Amino acid sequence: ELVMVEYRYGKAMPLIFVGGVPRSGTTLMRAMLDAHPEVRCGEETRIIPRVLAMRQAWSKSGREKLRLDEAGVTDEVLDAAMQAFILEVIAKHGEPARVLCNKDPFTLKSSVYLSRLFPNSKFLLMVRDGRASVHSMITRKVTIAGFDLSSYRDCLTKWNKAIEVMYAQCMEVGKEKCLPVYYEQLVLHPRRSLKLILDFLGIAWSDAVLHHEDLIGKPGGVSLSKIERSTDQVIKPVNLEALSKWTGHIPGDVVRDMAQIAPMLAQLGYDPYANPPNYGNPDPFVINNTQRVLKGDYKTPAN
Amino acid sequence: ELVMVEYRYGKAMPLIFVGGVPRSGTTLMRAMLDAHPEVRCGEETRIIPRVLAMRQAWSKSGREKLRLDEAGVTDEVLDAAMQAFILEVIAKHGEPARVLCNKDPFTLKSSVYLSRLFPNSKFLLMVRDGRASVHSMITRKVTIAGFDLSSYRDCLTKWNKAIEVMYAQCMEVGKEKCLPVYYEQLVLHPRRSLKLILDFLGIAWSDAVLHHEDLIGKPGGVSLSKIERSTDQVIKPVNLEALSKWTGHIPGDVVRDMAQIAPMLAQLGYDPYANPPNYGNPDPFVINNTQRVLKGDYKTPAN
Numbered sequence A, B: 001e002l003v004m005v006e007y008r009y010g011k012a013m014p015l016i017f018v019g020g021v022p023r024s025g026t027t028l029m030r031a032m033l034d035a036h037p038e039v040r041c042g043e044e045t046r047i048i049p050r051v052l053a054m055r056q057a058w059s060k061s062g063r064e065k066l067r068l069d070e071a072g073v074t075d076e077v078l079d080a081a082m083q084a085f086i087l088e089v090i091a092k093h094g095e096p097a098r099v100l101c102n103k104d105p106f107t108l109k110s111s112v113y114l115s116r117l118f119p120n121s122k123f124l125l126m127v128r129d130g131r132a133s134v135h136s137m138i139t140r141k142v143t144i145a146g147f148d149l150s151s152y153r154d155c156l157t158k159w160n161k162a163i164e165v166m167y168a169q170c171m172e173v174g175k176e177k178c179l180p181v182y183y184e185q186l187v188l189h190p191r192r193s194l195k196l197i198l199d200f201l202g203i204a205w206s207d208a209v210l211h212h213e214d215l216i217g218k219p220g221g222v223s224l225s226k227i228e229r230s231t232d233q234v235i236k237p238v239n240l241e242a243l244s245k246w247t248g249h250i251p252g253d254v255v256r257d258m259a260q261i262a263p264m265l266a267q268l269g270y271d272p273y274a275n276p277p278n279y280g281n282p283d284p285f286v287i288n289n290t291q292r293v294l295k296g297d298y299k300t301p302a303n
């Protein structure tokens, strides 16, 4: 119903929600979708997960839920207000496009709820080896509530619980509406991965998803925040630099206890005993991207 | 644009926002408006002030505002999302009506902002002697963040600062859009007061506003929350029981220092030296209401 410079948006439109634990390729994924001529994701809104969390807290409190129900502010009203708020933020914080998309990592803790609010929405759950994600948080000093960066053990424990929840939500939403996307397979085989992802989304193939680095900052392309912690990685083409760099840099006691700390590794198909797991041939495309990146073809932006 | 069982609602519609410090007649005011056939206010939503406060905090933080601006979540986007959220809650948490109304006391701390979000909205700032409001909070044990009920001095200090802010907002919005409504004049002269208020609002007179006790719980009437602290007072007709009952029950040192603790009393036209100020003849209507109330004509509801 609501319009934009002529695109119409509403609760029945086919939204794409991207998420996962931070440092799992979520920015790369949404940037590759942003490259598509029909899709716009844009930057992390930050406020969508905040308001979702507050609204969830309201109903989890017995005392507050009683007061809200007695005020006529029922689940039905809260849900309508969440729909309207989320739609405005998604629609207005970036360029209009036929298919709107949002990437705020921890929103996928609420994919069951979002799939009911937005009955035609679909979900991409980014999955990356928790050892790589946690190594990224600690070495880059990425602040995430609840993740004590002084402890690999604590961060892997918290990674495990977060992805356990999001994976359970993805399974409950079901295979027609939520697709786990493995970062390692995305970087090894981006063409095959995006072919599968766009088929799942019901969106026609476009080569543009393999050209996202051409489209940084351009109209209809990839809008980046200079403050977000993945920006200087996503300005490069898909490459292998970050695939395995955690290995040998995790404390020995955590390596020993890996499968007990992070049982979701094996649940998701990762080898929690290998340092590191042995992946097969990357596509020639990514091998060439990688040597260009490592020899300095992509300069650090002045901004 | 948006519809309801056929009433249309949107950001240009003529909303009424009622507010003031709690225990200042805000529930009585909105109940008298609810009695009008064209207006529905309903219960305190609770969540409108919460989300307003959070959204204000976002922009007050230099670091967070930079991140939001870099994400495309500008003031323009935040404002659109606030409009959509607030409208859904106002519209859906009670019955539809031609004129929608909201009463959440501390929202009038933001009347300048709300008047810009909703350019045809108008505001009723309830004003009651701060000694009566604070006496009410303390004796009824009404929990309000920042008000230490063990201290008349602290509560009057906090009352003073709250009404100072809301009155300044009312003056900035200007006389065409915000009307201070004095509780004491409402209860002494309800017909005259409501005539002035409905004229200010641009709404035709209806006798119903002087019959709100007939309309409790009825369709098109006054919906109450059994948990709100004013409910067992507002089920009675306008009466004088609460006009002056604070007098002699305030600690002597606070009486001595009243004008220094609460300079807004004199600013608003109250006599901060009188215990209590001497009001003139109540309307016969209210005198009769009062003896009926005090002799027990209105039974305590079983619920």
Ligand SMILES: Nc1ncnc2c1ncn2[C@@H]1O[C@H](COP(=O)(O)O)[C@@H](OP(=O)(O)O)[C@H]1O
Residues within 6 Å of the ligand: A021, A022, A023, A024, A025, A026, A027, A028, A132, A135, A136, A137, A140, A187, A230, A233, A234, A235, A236, A237, A238, A239, A240, A241, A242
């Ligand atoms: N073009 C690209 N090719 C491969 N990985 C990329 C990439 N752009 C970003 N990534 C990876 O995405 C990870 C961040 O994920 P997220 O966006 O969910 O926070 C970073 O991992 P590292 O910090 O281990 O390098 C980054 O290397």
Ligand SMILES: Nc1ncnc2c1ncn2[C@@H]1O[C@H](COP(=O)(O)O)[C@@H](OP(=O)(O)O)[C@H]1O
Residues within 6 Å of the ligand: B021, B022, B023, B024, B025, B026, B027, B028, B132, B135, B136, B137, B140, B187, B230, B233, B234, B235, B236, B237, B238, B239, B240, B241, B242
């Ligand atoms: N019918 C009525 N006539 C007069 N005052 C009323 C009333 N219904 C409620 N009020 C007063 O409204 C005050 C509460 O204001 P609010 O709704 O803003 O919290 C209560 O003051 P007291 O607690 O001093 O009795 C209550 O007495």
Ligand code: NA
Residues within 6 Å of the ligand: A033, A034, A035, A036, A037, A038, A039, A040, A097, A220, A221
């Ligand atoms: Na695009």
Ligand code: NA
Residues within 6 Å of the ligand: A043, A223, A224, A225, A226, B069, B070, B071, B072
């Ligand atoms: Na930006």
Ligand code: NA
Residues within 6 Å of the ligand: B033, B034, B035, B036, B037, B038, B039, B040, B097, B220, B221
């Ligand atoms: Na009404």
Ligand code: NA
Residues within 6 Å of the ligand: A069, A070, A071, A072, B043, B223, B224, B225, B226
């Ligand atoms: Na109710």
Ligand SMILES: [Zn+2]
Residues within 6 Å of the ligand: A210, A211, A214
């Ligand atoms: Zn290219």
Ligand SMILES: [Zn+2]
Residues within 6 Å of the ligand: A135, A139, A245, A246, A249
């Ligand atoms: Zn390392």
Ligand SMILES: [Zn+2]
Residues within 6 Å of the ligand: B210, B211, B214
């Ligand atoms: Zn009557």
Ligand SMILES: [Zn+2]
Residues within 6 Å of the ligand: B135, B139, B245, B246, B249
């Ligand atoms: Zn008393």
